[PDB]
Amino acid sequence: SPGIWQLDCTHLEGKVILVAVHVASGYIEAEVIPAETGQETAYFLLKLAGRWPVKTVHTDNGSNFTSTTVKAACWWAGIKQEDGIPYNPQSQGVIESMNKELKKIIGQVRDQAEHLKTAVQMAVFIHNHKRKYSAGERIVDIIATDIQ
Amino acid sequence: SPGIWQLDCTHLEGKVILVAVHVASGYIEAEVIPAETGQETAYFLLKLAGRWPVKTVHTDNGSNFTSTTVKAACWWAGIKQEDGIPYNPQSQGVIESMNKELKKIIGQVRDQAEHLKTAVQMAVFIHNHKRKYSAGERIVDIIATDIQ
Numbered sequence: 001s002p003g004i005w006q007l008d009c010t011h012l013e014g015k016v017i018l019v020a021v022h023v024a025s026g027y028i029e030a031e032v033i034p035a036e037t038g039q040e041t042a043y044f045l046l047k048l049a050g051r052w053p054v055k056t057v058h059t060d061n062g063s064n065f066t067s068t069t070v071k072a073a074c075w076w077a078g079i080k081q082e083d084g085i086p087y088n089p090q091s092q093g094v095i096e097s098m099n100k101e102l103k104k105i106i107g108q109v110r111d112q113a114e115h116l117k118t119a120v121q122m123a124v125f126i127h128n129h130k131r132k133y134s135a136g137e138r139i140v141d142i143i144a145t146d147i148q
Numbered sequence: 149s150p151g152i153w154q155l156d157c158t159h160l161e162g163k164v165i166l167v168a169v170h171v172a173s174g175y176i177e178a179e180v181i182p183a184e185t186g187q188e189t190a191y192f193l194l195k196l197a198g199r200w201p202v203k204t205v206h207t208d209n210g211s212n213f214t215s216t217t218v219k220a221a222c223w224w225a226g227i228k229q230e231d232g233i234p235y236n237p238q239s240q241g242v243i244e245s246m247n248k249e250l251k252k253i254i255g256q257v258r259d260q261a262e263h264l265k266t267a268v269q270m271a272v273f274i275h276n277h278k279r280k281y282s283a284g285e286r287i288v289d290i291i292a293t294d295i296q
């Protein structure tokens with residue numbers, strides 16, 4: 001549905017890349033953090049929910065699901081926190097392929113940026129703009145349709 | 149029109165709040181930084197352009213307009229950099245009112261967050277969700293219409 005997002009955490013260069021995927025479109029937002037904490041995850045979700053109409057988040061692991069700080073952010077922002085258990089198993093493989101794909105793009109841009117965070121944002125750009133309609137186009141269409 | 153954004157820089161608690169406003173909708177994204185530099189502005193624009201289809205940015209001052217780093221980011225992301233000179237003078241006053249309004253909201257949430265950055269993201273949330281349709285709804289509709 002239009003409001004469903006999935007959290008995803010992947011590792012690169014001794015750092016963590018936290019990713020939110022809009023499940024119906026494939027659109028992503030991402031940030032680099034030193035390590036996955038409840039505090040970082042809570043702040044990331046607050047940013048996300050101020051930018052898109054986030055109704056439901058499938059959390060990436062049990063620690064973030066349990067985190068009182070993540071729960072506080074979800075309460076504040078009106079997000080239903082759910083487990084991310086892939087009862088449909090093609091869900092997990094799609095996330096796995098996306099992490100591989102994002103890492104490939106990061107490799108392709110890596111030498112154009114001094115800092116990993118910049119390379120990650122370049123990769124977000126390329127991912128969201130790539131036509132296959134683009135993910136950026138798909139999310140806007142899905143949400144506009146839901147509004148009207 | 150769907151692709152036009154305006155940069156805006158305002159001060160609070162000895163820090164800087166960098167804001168991008170989607171002119172046709174009133175939708176905003178914002179971040180807290182220690183001070184306005186070309187490097188921070190460049191990174192902010194890269195993030196913005198990976199998330200929304202940014203065609204044109206009216207820069208907030210001559211230093212960011214001149215900055216080689218900001219120019220590099222605009223080139224990379226396919227953004228036309230323009231001056232933000234308000235040849236229509238009601239433009240400035242609208243930005244002024246928005247800064248006042250954002251600061252009011254920040255004051256209303258300030259005690260719910262330990263860190264200013266959190267209060268700012270709460271304020272972004274409230275601003276974008278407030279029905280006036282909300283700014284969040286307006287930007288999605290404008291861009292979806294442009295896609296079709």
Ligand SMILES: O=C(O)c1c(C[C@@H]2C(=O)Nc3ccccc32)ccc2c1OCO2
Nearest residue numbers: 039042043072073076260261262263266
């Ligand atoms: O105290 C903070 O500023 C803070 C919080 C808690 C804050 C709150 O009290 N309630 C609430 C609700 C939603 C998001 C963040 C919060 C979470 C994560 C953070 C924070 O600073 C940066 O990363």
Ligand SMILES: O=C(O)c1c(C[C@@H]2C(=O)Nc3ccccc32)ccc2c1OCO2
Nearest residue numbers: 112113114115118187190191220221224
């Ligand atoms: O070198 C960086 O990582 C970097 C850049 C330059 C980088 C580039 O070389 N080209 C380019 C194009 C678009 C955005 C950033 C850049 C700008 C701003 C930053 C940076 O790190 C964090 O804040």
